[PDB]
Design a protein around this ligand. Structure first.
Ligand SMILES: *[C@@H]1O[C@H](CO)[C@@H](O[C@@H]2O[C@H](CO)[C@@H](O)[C@H](O)[C@H]2NC(C)=O)[C@H](O)[C@H]1NC(C)=O
Ligand SMILES: *[C@@H]1O[C@H](CO)[C@@H](O[C@@H]2O[C@H](CO)[C@@H](O)[C@H](O)[C@H]2NC(C)=O)[C@H](O)[C@H]1NC(C)=O
Ligand SMILES: [Cu+2]
Ligand SMILES: [Cu+2]
Ligand SMILES: [Cu+2]
Length: 497
C-alpha cells in the first residue's frame, strides 16, 4: 500500500539482507526502500516522522527531505539538516506539514542528515494528477509501476574509512539485487506486465552515488516526465539516470509473452551482469517462472540525450538568449582537493544554527550568515543563471537545487546552449571536463535553498552552497510552527551544544 498524504512514518533500525548479506540499516516504514508516500496535486501532506533510532553507528538523529517539492511558504519543512532545521532527536516526532500546489510527478524522500540516506532512509514520493495531460498514453500507473534504482553498501556510511575509495556492493532494483563480490543467488525483483497493456513506469534513482545505464531487453521506453516536469514523448532504448533524477516512461507490453532482463549498470562497482548482478526481471503474465534468456545489444540504438528532451508545456527559458542574459548571472568555481570539495573556494561544513533560524533571528545579509562564504543571497523576482563548469574529480556530478526546478540551458557533452525549449528538471549532470552546464530559474520562493552535488559522499565532503533567496521576505513568507521552534533547543540540549 501507498501511504499519505496524511500519515505517520516511523524511522527505525533493523537488519536487512537485500543482496543476501545481513547488515543493520536506517529504515522508514520498516522496509528498504521505504513505503511510497503519495497524494494528488495540491494536497496537504502531513508526514509525522517518529524518530525511533537507537543505533549510533548510523546516527540516532534524523531529518527528512521531500526531494523536488518546492516548499513555498514552508521552507522550515524542507529537511536539510542545519539549512532549514535542526535534526529530530530520538524518541521525538515532527510533523512535516506542507502543500504541493502546482506540482505533479515523480519525487522521492530521503534523510538529509550526513550520509544517513545511504544507510537506508530513502523511498518514493508520488504526486498524481487527476487531470494528467499524459493520462491517455498508458493504462496502468500505481505502486507496481514504480522502479527504484539503489546503490547498497556492506560497510556502514559512518564507517567508510577516511582515505579509501568508496564503492557499492550491490545494485538494488525495487530493493533486491545481487552482490558484486561473493555473489549469491538471492532473489531478484520481478516487475509484472500483461501483454497488450501500457504502463507508466516511474523510474526513480535513489542512489547515493552511481549513475545507472537503465534498459529493458527487447523493449523501448517512451519518456513523458523528467524530474516532475511533463515532457514531449521521447522514445529511447537506454536511460543514463544520475543520482536523485526521475523519469516516467511508457512501457508497451508489446513483446512475446516471456521473461526479459531489466538492466541497471552503475558507473562504478560491478561491471556487467554475471550471476545476475545489476539485474531484475520483467515477467509477462502467463510466462514461465524462470530467468530471462535475453541479451542486451552491444550498442544501444537510441540512448537518452538530455538535449532531446523538451517540456510538454510551453515553458520557454527566462531571461535573454545569451550567456549572462539574466538579472543575476553566476558562474560557480567547483573544485576538489585533498579530500574536500569547494564552491568559490569554500567547502561546506554545516553550521551550528540552521541557516533559516539565523535569518529568522535577524541576520539579514548573506555575508552575516554562517557558514561564512557558503551562503549567497539571491534577489527576489529575478532571473538567475548559474553556470556549473565541470572538471572537479569524482564526476560526473549531479547538481540539485532545493525549492526550485530550472531550465537546463546547457547540458553535458554539448557546448551549444538552448534558450528556446530545453527541458526543466531539478537534478542535472554537470558533465565532463570543459563542459559548461548552465541552469536558469526565477526567484519566487523566499527562503534558504540548498544547492549541492547529489553524490552523498561529495555533499558530506563539502560540495554545496546555500542560496538565501529573498532574505528580506523569508520571515513573513515562512511562518514557523512551535514544533519547529522547539527542534534546535531539544537537539542542542541532547548533544550538549
Ligand atoms: C561558462 O559560461 C560562463 C557564462 O555563463 C562563462 O563566464 C564568463 O567567464 C569569463 C572568464 O572565463 C568572464 O570574463 C565573463 O565575465 C563570464 N560571463 C559571461 C561572458 O557571460 C564561463 O567562462 C564559462 N565556462 C567555461 C568553462 O566554459
Ligand atoms: C546539442 O545541443 C543543441 C542545443 O540544445 C542541439 O541543437 C538543437 O538541435 C535541434 C534538433 O536538430 C534543433 O531543432 C534546434 O534548433 C537546435 N538548437 C540549437 C540552439 O542549436 C543539438 O541537437 C545537440 N547536439 C546533439 C548531437 O544532440
Ligand atoms: Cu531536494
Ligand atoms: Cu559530486
Ligand atoms: Cu538535497
Amino acid at each position: 500500500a501507498q501511504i499519505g498524504p496524511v500519515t505517520d512514518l516511523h524511522i527505525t533500525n533493523a537488519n536487512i539482507s537485500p543482496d543476501g548479506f545481513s547488515r543493520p540499516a536506517v529504515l522508514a516504514g520498516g522496509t528498504f526502500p521505504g513505503p511510497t508516500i503519495a497524494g494528488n496535486t495540491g494536497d496537504n501532506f502531513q508526514i509525522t516522522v517518529f524518530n525511533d533510532l537507537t543505533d549510533p553507528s548510523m546516527l540516532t538523529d534524523t531529518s527528512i527531505h521531500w526531494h523536488g517539492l518546492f516548499q513555498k511558504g514552508t521552507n522550515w519543512a524542507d529537511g536539510p539538516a542545519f539549512v532549514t532545521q535542526c535534526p529530530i532527536i530520538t524518541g521525538q516526532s515532527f510533523d512535516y506539514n506542507f502543500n504541493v500546489p502546482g506540482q505533479a510527478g515523480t519525487f522521492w524522500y530521503h534523510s538529509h542528515l550526513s550520509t544517513q540516506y545511504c544507510d537506508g532512509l530513502r523511498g518514493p514520493f508520488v504526486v498524481y494528477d487527476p487531470n494528467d495531460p499524459n493520462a491517455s498514453l498508458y493504462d496502468v500507473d500505481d505502486d507496481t509501476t514504480i522502479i527504484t534504482l539503489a546503490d547498497w553498501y556492506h560497510t556502514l556510511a559512518q564507517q567508510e574509512p577516511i582515505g579509501a575509495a568508496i564503492t557499492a556492493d550491490a545494485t538494488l532494483i525495487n530493493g533486491l539485487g545481487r552482490s558484486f563480490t561473493n555473489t549469491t543467488a538471492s532473489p531478484l525483483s520481478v516487475i509484472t506486465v500483461q501483454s497488450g497493456k501500457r504502463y507508466r513506469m516511474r523510474l526513480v534513482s535513489i542512489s547515493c552515488d552511481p549513475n545507472y545505464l537503465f534498459s529493458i531487453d527487447g523493449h523501448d521506453m517512451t519518456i513523458i516526465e523528467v524530474d516532475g516536469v511533463n515532457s514531449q514523448q521521447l522514445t529511447v532504448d537506454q536511460i543514463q539516470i544520475f543520482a536523485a533524477q526521475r523519469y516516467s516512461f511508457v512501457l508497451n507490453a508489446n513483446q512475446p509473452v516471456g521473461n526479459y532482463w531489466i538492466r541497471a549498470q552503475p558507473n562504478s562497482g560491478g561491471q556487467g551482469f554475471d550471476g545476475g548482478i545489476n539485474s531484475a526481471i520483467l515477467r509477462y503474465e502467463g510466462a514461465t517462472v524462470e530467468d530471462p534468456t535475453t541479451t542486451a545489444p552491444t550498442t544501444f540504438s537510441n540512448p537518452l540525450v538530455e538535449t532531446d528532451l523538451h517540456p510538454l508545456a510551453d515553458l520557454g527559458v527566462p531571461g535573454q538568449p545569451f550567456r549572462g542574459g539574466a538579472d543575476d548571472p553566476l558562474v560557480l568555481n567547483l573544485a576538489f582537493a585533498n579530500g574536500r570539495f569547494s564552491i568559490d573556494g569554500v567547502s561546506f561544513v554545516p553550521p551550528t544554527v540552521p541557516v533559516l533560524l539565523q535569518i529568522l533571528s535577524g541576520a539579514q545579509n548573506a555575508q552575516d550568515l554562517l557558514p561564512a562564504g557558503s551562503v549567497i543571497s539571491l534577489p527576489s523576482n529575478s532571473v538567475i543563471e548559474v553556470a556549473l563548469p565541470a572538471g572537479a574529480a569524482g564526476g560526473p556530478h549531479p547538481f540539485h537545487l532545493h525549492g526550485h526546478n530550472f531550465a537546463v540551458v546547457q547540458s553535458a557533452n554539448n557546448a551549444t546552449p538552448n534558450y528556446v525549449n530545453p527541458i526543466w528538471r531539478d537534478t542535472v549532470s554537470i558533465g565532463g571536463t570543459g563542459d559548461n552546464v548552465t541552469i536558469r530559474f526565477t526567484t519566487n520562493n523566499p527562503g534558504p535553498w540548498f544547492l549541492h552535488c547529489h553524490i552523498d559522499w561529495h555533499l558530506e565532503a563539502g560540495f554545496a552552497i546555500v542560496f538565501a533567496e529573498d532574505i528580506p521576505d523569508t520571515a513573513s513568507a515562512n511562518p514557523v510552527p512551535q514544533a519547529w521552534s522547539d527542534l534546535c533547543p531539544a537537539y542542542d540540549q541532547a548533544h550538549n551544544i
